[PDB]
From a paper:
[name] is a small phosphatase containing 184 residues, and the sequence contains a catalytic domain as well as an N-terminal myristoylation site. This enzyme is broadly expressed in different tissues and plays important roles in the regulation of signaling pathways, such as inactivating the T cell receptor (TCR) signaling pathway, activating the JNK signaling pathway, and regulating the phosphorylation of focal adhesion kinase (FAK). The phosphatase domain of [name] consists of five twisted β-sheets and six α-helices, and the structural scaffold is similar to that of DUSP3 (VHR), while [name] does not contain an N-terminal α-helix surrounded by the N-loop. In this region, the catalytic activity is facilitated by C88 in the P-loop and D57 in the D-loop, and the hydrogen bonding network is formed by D57 in the D-loop, S93 in the P-loop, and N128 in the N-loop.
Structural alignment among N128A, N128D, and WT_VO4 revealed that N128 participated in forming the conformation of the D-loop. In the N128A structure, one hydrogen bond was formed between the side chain of S93 and the backbone amide of A128. The interaction between D57 and N128 was broken, and no water-mediated hydrogen bonds connected them. The D-loop was shifted away in the N128A mutant, indicating that the hydrogen bond from S93 was not sufficient to stabilize the D-loop. The negative charge from D128 in the N128D mutant induced charge repulsion against D57, which resulted in unclear electron density in the conformation of the D-loop and slightly shifted the N-loop. These results clearly indicated that the N128-D57 interaction anchored the D-loop and stabilized the conformation of the active site. N128A and N128D increased the KM more than 30 times, but the kcat values were different. N128D decreased the kcat by 16 times, while the kcat of N128A only decreased 2.5 times. Disruption of the DPN–triloop interaction by N128A and N128D critically decrease the catalytic efficiency by 100–500 times because it induces conformation changes in the D-loop and perturbs the conformation of the P-loop. N128A does not form a barrier against D57, so D57 can interact with S93 due to D-loop dynamics and catalyze the substrate, while this interaction is not stable and induces a high KM.
Numbering used by the authors: -1 to 154
Write the structure that this text describes.
């Protein structure tokens, strides 16, 4: 459906879900989620036992997510390098959270955005970034992802 069917594993230690999944104690415990990247309107830390990164991004054609790629990748990557599990979520788990995870996958592999989206969809079939985010991801692939891969090498 249009908000998925529960949070889904994308890679080891990396999950995508909707805002309800992100409050579901049964899902968080079963998937051992200890880090949540919340990317939606008025995102704030909610639960105990969880490290949050909150990005107040709207579902709007004007919303810039590229400027949040670096902070998001650092948060996800440092969680995963510690052997812990991160959930990235927005409202529906379809567009905003998916875009950040695509940028992560592109940075830790040699994938362009379309192969990164294929990877997300293998775990979360409803994934579908809005057209504005597709444009940002294509520009990222063309001009920036190579710089981000070098940054990842130098940092970690």
């Amino acid at each position: 459906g249009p908000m998925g069917n529960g949070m889904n594993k994308i890679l080891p230690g990396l999950y995508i879900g909707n805002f309800k999944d992100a409050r579901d104690a049964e899902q968080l415990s079963k998937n051992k989620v200890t880090h949540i990247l919340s990317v939606h309107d008025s995102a704030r830390p909610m639960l105990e036992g969880v490290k949050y990164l909150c990005i107040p991004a709207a579902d709007s054609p004007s919303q810039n997510l590229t400027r949040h790629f670096k902070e998001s990748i650092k948060f996800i990557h440092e969680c995963r390098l510690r052997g812990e599990s991160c959930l990235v979520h927005c409202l529906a788990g379809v567009s905003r959270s998916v875009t950040l995870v695509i940028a992560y996958i592109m940075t830790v592999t040699d994938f362009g955005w379309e192969d990164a989206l294929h990877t997300v969809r293998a775990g979360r079939s409803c994934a579908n970034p809005a057209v504005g985010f597709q444009r940002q991801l294509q520009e990222f692939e063309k001009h920036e992802v190579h710089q981000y891969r070098q940054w990842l090498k130098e940092e970690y």
